[PDB]
Amino acid sequence: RREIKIEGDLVLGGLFPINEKGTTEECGRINEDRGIQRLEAMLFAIDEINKDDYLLPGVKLGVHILDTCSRDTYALEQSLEFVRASLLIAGVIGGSYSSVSIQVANLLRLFQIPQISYASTSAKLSDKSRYDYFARTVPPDFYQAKAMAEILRFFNWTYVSTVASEGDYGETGIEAFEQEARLRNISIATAEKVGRIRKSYDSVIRELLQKPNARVVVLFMRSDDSRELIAAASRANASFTWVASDGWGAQESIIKGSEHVAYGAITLELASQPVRQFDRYFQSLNPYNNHRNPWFRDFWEQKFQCSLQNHRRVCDKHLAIDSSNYEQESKIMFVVNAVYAMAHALHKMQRTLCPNTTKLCDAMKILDGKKLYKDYLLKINFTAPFNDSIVKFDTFGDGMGRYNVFNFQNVGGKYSYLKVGHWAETLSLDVNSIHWS
Amino acid sequence: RREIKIEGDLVLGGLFPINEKGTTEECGRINEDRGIQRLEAMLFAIDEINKDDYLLPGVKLGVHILDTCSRDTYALEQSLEFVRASLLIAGVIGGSYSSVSIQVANLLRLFQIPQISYASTSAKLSDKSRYDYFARTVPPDFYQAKAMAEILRFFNWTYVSTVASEGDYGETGIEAFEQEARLRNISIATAEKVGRIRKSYDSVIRELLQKPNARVVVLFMRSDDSRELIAAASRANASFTWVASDGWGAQESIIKGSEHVAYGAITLELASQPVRQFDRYFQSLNPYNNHRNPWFRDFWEQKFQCSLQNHRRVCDKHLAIDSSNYEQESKIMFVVNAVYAMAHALHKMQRTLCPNTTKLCDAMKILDGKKLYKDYLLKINFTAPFNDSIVKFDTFGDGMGRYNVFNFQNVGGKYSYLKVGHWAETLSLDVNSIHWS
Ligand SMILES: N[C@](CC1c2ccccc2Oc2ccccc21)(C(=O)O)[C@H]1C[C@@H]1C(=O)O
Ligand SMILES: N[C@](CC1c2ccccc2Oc2ccccc21)(C(=O)O)[C@H]1C[C@@H]1C(=O)O
Numbered sequence A, B: 001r002r003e004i005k006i007e008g009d010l011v012l013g014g015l016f017p018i019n020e021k022g023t024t025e026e027c028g029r030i031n032e033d034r035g036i037q038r039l040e041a042m043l044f045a046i047d048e049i050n051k052d053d054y055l056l057p058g059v060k061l062g063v064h065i066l067d068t069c070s071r072d073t074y075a076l077e078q079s080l081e082f083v084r085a086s087l088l089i090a091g092v093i094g095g096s097y098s099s100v101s102i103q104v105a106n107l108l109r110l111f112q113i114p115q116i117s118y119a120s121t122s123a124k125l126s127d128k129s130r131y132d133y134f135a136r137t138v139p140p141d142f143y144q145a146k147a148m149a150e151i152l153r154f155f156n157w158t159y160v161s162t163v164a165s166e167g168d169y170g171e172t173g174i175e176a177f178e179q180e181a182r183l184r185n186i187s188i189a190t191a192e193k194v195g196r197i198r199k200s201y202d203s204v205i206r207e208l209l210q211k212p213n214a215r216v217v218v219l220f221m222r223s224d225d226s227r228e229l230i231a232a233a234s235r236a237n238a239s240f241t242w243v244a245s246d247g248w249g250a251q252e253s254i255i256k257g258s259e260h261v262a263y264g265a266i267t268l269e270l271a272s273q274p275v276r277q278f279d280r281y282f283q284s285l286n287p288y289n290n291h292r293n294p295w296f297r298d299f300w301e302q303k304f305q306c307s308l309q310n311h312r313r314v315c316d317k318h319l320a321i322d323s324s325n326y327e328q329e330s331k332i333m334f335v336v337n338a339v340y341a342m343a344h345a346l347h348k349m350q351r352t353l354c355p356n357t358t359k360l361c362d363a364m365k366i367l368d369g370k371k372l373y374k375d376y377l378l379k380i381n382f383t384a385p386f387n388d389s390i391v392k393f394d395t396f397g398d399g400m401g402r403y404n405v406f407n408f409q410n411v412g413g414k415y416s417y418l419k420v421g422h423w424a425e426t427l428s429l430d431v432n433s434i435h436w437s
């Protein structure tokens, strides 16, 4: 029922997991980082573009923002509002979960509405024919498989074993790693999978022990699966050199109480830099100055376990989002770059189709989505506005594969993940900073 | 803007090409046979089912009927009305043109709404994964390719040449014939195509003459392409034994003025029988008793070139649809069988999910479209209501491939197409009635 509907000459649709997938109820609690923060980054980006005197000087961007409630079917129903509009919906920003972005993309292509996801990393969305109106500022996860294969090939690690989670993430990732290993003459000792139980991980650990020549284990697993496998490795006192995808990444929750077996592990994470101006914008928001966001009062009441309006404690008027209770969500840069990619494509389109004017001409009021996607959006190339990193898409509409390389080690009586490298198209490692086990 | 919206316990969506694809304007003239007649066959079928005391005894069927205007994009926009409904839209009947049914099917699968086409014959719609909510009472055209290959194999015609129209119909049909010929050890001399010009056909005829050993020509062409190729064959005085798909069929317009070169031609047509009770129902309709159809007054004014309400002649009050100006459209049986297939699937579903009641229970008010399609609709098997011919679908949702075999000949100083056989799964020919050339 809730929405953010702001008028403009051109309107961008937005889809965010503002609320978690509910349990009795369809929608759960507010999602603070993937929902509120990401939605406010798109509003921040719109405000900035509208303020800019060089980008779309005569065209004001409006918005139509909706909650996906972290569910495919709910997001599809919401997306009908963007299709009914045929508000001048020029394109859609979102969603977050790949399963939501797949269903939205199946609908939007039918009405030729371009879509840019700032978070969906499934390999399926790369399909030029099935998702011919979809683009993304994030790279697909199959580039992690390529980056891991390139890390092994560098260290000449020719004999390895693999563990994968069940589902799109784990299966597609190890299937891509298997192919990337074959091309690099890397032989896979044993390939294990993990379904949806404590014993299951011990069966995998035992099966990994059956090939003692393969000291390197390559993981393409979800967070919970990664923690549980390292726990079973801890129980069996089985120490391996783990090479893992972002499912493990640089999360301290994974290695907690199992740092011996997990020592020297090589992990990947999506490389991103914070948007400093966003921290200032987000920390200044309060229930008194943020009337345009209809979810903000529930976000505030939930974040601070208080009531703004008697069994509930009254919100102290001096509460604030600040350094002690806030950290910029890892994908804020991708939200901002997605909105700017749409603006840059629209700007170039208006300049070509509306000669000798800055205003939105008739040729663009009857907007050709096919032209916008193929001839403008897929051909954008600009410097990220708050970074010199380039925003651009390949012919599949995929953003550039840039990952940080981490090494789990202890220096100065503290266990931390250390940034020991980066993968862009070529691997770059600071080898003399890596610890082994 | 116009529609037929009739309330019921369960409502069926309907899509018909009531108006032709417009030219200035988006929608053209009324389409009398594929539009008005086919829409009235669905209303006839609904009335009959509702009157029946054994089929859905406690569930009244309603309708929501819309004009596709013979265009993909217009039909997609119309279909949003069936999706917005989530009226209790249980399923959709239509469309006619395969291009319209493809776009509708792309939308309806997303909201799990089963769809039955009474006319769309494209091979694409057979795809179990891409069109997983689509079924049809007509067979796909690739069964014509199989039937023609079986006619050649019977007469031991091992050396043949092929001509195909450009587009889905001709290309897919000859591609399927090429595969069906390989399996029957039939060698193809030359494979010609026809684009979108009088000279083009002469180039094909000349190229066919280059292989004089191949006296049999297999055609998979559109009506206009078929007439023009027989015209070029007439000009080059090139007489062949033509084996053609329903694009030519038993149309006298194809052979007009070119009966010598076209003599003895073997052609296919979709086998159908008229629904006798429909003739009585359709011929009784007049502008005074048909208020539920909002397009009928324009149909009447167009059919009779008159005005019901001064430069226009006033409609004579004694005008009527009758034997002199009406003939039952060839696919009326498929419209009626599509509506009955949906009713039978709903009837079996209500009997299983609503025990000890005939009424629509809560388990069916929140209708599971996935169950309706896979467990009920794909498993129907009933005698056609106004025929003993069986209505059933295969695992792809395709209706049974039943074609009549025609032979163009002269008997008693009159040129006519004679029914000389039938193809169901096995070919059946009355060989001693076939003329050659
Ligand atoms: N990138 C996500 C997550 C990504 C993923 C991709 C496809 C399927 C499953 C799947 O689950 C995992 C599990 C572990 C690590 C990464 C993923 C996406 O759903 O695409 C998106 C939720 C993330 C966000 O909103 O930041
Ligand atoms: N069966 C049709 C027509 C069928 C066809 C199928 C796919 C592509 C093109 C194509 O065009 C031809 C040409 C000649 C003969 C048969 C077809 C369909 O569009 O499916 C549908 C309009 C017919 C109806 O409403 O009766």
Ligand SMILES: [Cl-]
Binding pocket: A015, A016, A017, A068, A070, A071, A095, A096, A097, A100
């Ligand atoms: Cl989402």
Ligand SMILES: [Cl-]
Binding pocket: A166, A167, A168, A169, A170
């Ligand atoms: Cl998954």
Ligand SMILES: [Cl-]
Binding pocket: B015, B016, B017, B068, B070, B071, B095, B096, B097, B100
């Ligand atoms: Cl149609």
Ligand SMILES: [Cl-]
Binding pocket: B166, B167, B168, B169, B170
């Ligand atoms: Cl065609």
